[PDB]
Amino acid sequence: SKTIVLSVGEATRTLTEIQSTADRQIFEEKVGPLVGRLRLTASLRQNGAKTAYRVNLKLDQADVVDCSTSVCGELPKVRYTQVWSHDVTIVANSTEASRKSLYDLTKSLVATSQVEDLVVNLVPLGR
Amino acid sequence: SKTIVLSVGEATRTLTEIQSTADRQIFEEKVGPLVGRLRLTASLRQNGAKTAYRVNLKLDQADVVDCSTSVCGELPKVRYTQVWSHDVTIVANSTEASRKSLYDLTKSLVATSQVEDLVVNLVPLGR
Amino acid sequence: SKTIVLSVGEATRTLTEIQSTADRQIFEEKVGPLVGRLRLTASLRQNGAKTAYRVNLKLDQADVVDCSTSVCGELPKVRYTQVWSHDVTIVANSTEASRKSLYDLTKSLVATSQVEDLVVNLVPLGR
Amino acid sequence: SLPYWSRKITLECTPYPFTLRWEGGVHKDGIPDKVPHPSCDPGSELVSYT
RNA sequence: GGGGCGAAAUGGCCUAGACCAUGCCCCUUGGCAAACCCAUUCGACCGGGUUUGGGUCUUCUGACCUCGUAGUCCGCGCUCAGCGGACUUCGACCA
């Protein structure tokens, strides 16, 4: 259907569209076990009286564990669950240059080393 | 506009459309003096509750007289007026063969010598 | 349709038939904006008891204004309206030579310089 | 729908006239009145121009 | 409470007629669809409160997005986008 290729550095992951709907788009990653994998929820809507819009993007990935390699008998069981949602409130009558600058600033803040340290070492952002 | 050619035997007369309208079509003959000439009125309509139709065809021709050839002063003045109207009440859901037979019978009755004698000598139809 | 070419001296204007009807003929000039342009209304009828006739000819032209060249929002708006109607009451049984002489006299009175001054400088006709 | 093509090009500028002027004359030895017509009158001439 | 009725169910009046008694017909308006808030097993749990709901520019007249409603000519061709397109009107939180 709809395929999305993501480059991690040495391997390429493929996400496939599974629940094609306007108000809710569900992309699932196809690698092996479908249960407890990478899922992405996308939603687009309006607000108020036709003024602006609302975009929601959530990315979930639950780790799985299995004991069939050593223990006699244990089905693949999920462990923890991670939720990373978003919220985009951009009005229609805006500015293309301003939107591009905002996207570039967001990309720079994501690619910077401060957010990576905040995520890994749990140290508050402040360098 | 719309021209109609009628053959009388030795000459050809031309009638021209003048008042193009759906509910009333007025054809006038163009030969010389437009006032007091040959006129034809056609009308088409429905009836009741969409059942049949109604067609009306009238043909008028008023003779004119003039004294400018001998007398000093006399404008062309109309004399008598002749009115020959019609009435067609044919339903839609009929028969093409029956309509053709009726038209042929009407044409034969018109072209027969009895109606000509009834018109000329004013003798009642009965030969 | 029906096209009418008018020569103003250096350019040629084209009027197109819009509302083809017997009792009301509406010609409209096609140059650019259709609203607020040159329109011509023609009508022909009879009178009394099939004695004479009646011809009516009206010519209208409303000027338009627009501010989109400088002001940032103004639709084309009409200003004033000019009405120039006519009335022709010529009997059928007349004289071709008399009608031609009358038409020539009217053309001369229209092309004379006195009516032009009366129209422009608003000075009463009397030279 | 049918195919179609066209093109356009224009060039124009707005007109705007203006004027420039300048006057002068010969400098004299101690003449306090140097006009288009020097009011004074020493001993020589002053051509001037405007 | 505010009305209706003598019709319609009968009883007085009861050629006819128009009024009477119980007696029977309606209103107690209604709906918004979203977003957020509490104490806690320190959310699962039902219930409540607040901000919005055709919308802006001068939401003054008047226009600029949208549509809904009609009437009128309409193209069987001219325009770079094209197109099927024109003009005038009333309404626009919902039954």
Curated annotation (Swiss-Prot), chains A, B, C:
InterPro entries associated with the record: Phage_PP7_CP, Phage_RNA-type_capsid
UniProt KW keywords: Capsid protein, Disulfide bond, RNA-binding, T=3 icosahedral capsid protein, Translation regulation, Virion
Transmembrane domains' residue ranges: none
Domain of life: Viruses
GO CC entries: T=3 icosahedral viral capsid
Residues annotated to bind RNA: 39, 45, 52, 54, 58, 60, 83, 85, 89
Entry keyword annotation includes Transit peptide: no
Subcellular location: Virion
Record carries keyword Membrane: no
Annotated effect of mutating residue 60 to Y: Loss of translational repressor activity
Consequence recorded when altering residue 52 to L/P: Loss of translational repressor activity
GO molecular function: identical protein binding; RNA binding
Predominant location: virion
GO aspect biological process, one term: regulation of translation
Role of this protein: Capsid protein self-assembles to form an icosahedral capsid with a T=3 symmetry, about 26 nm in diameter, and consisting of 89 capsid proteins dimers (178 capsid proteins). Involved in viral genome encapsidation through the interaction between a capsid protein dimer and the multiple packaging signals present in the RNA genome. Acts as a translational repressor of viral replicase synthesis late in infection. This latter function is the result of capsid protein interaction with an RNA hairpin which contains the replicase ribosome-binding site.
Quaternary structure (record): Homodimer. The dimers in the capsid are covalently linked with disulfide bridges. The homodimers binds to the viral RNA via an operator hairpin, but also to many other RNA sequences in the viral genome; this interaction probably shifts the virus from the replicative to the assembly phase and ensures specific encapsidation of the viral genome.
UniProt similarity note: Belongs to the Leviviricetes capsid protein family.
Protein name: Capsid protein
From Swiss-Prot, chain D:
Name by which UniProt lists this protein: Maturation protein A
Function field: The maturation protein is required for the typical attachment of the phage to the side of the bacterial F-pili. Binds to sequences located toward each end of the genome, hence circularizing it. The RNA genome-maturation protein A complex is released from the capsid upon host receptor binding. Maturation protein A enters the cell along with the viral RNA.
Coiled-coil ranges from the UniProt annotation: none
Domain of life: Viruses
Location within or outside the cell: Virion
Family: Belongs to the Leviviricetes maturation protein family.
Quaternary structure annotation from Swiss-Prot or TrEMBL: Interacts with the host pilus.
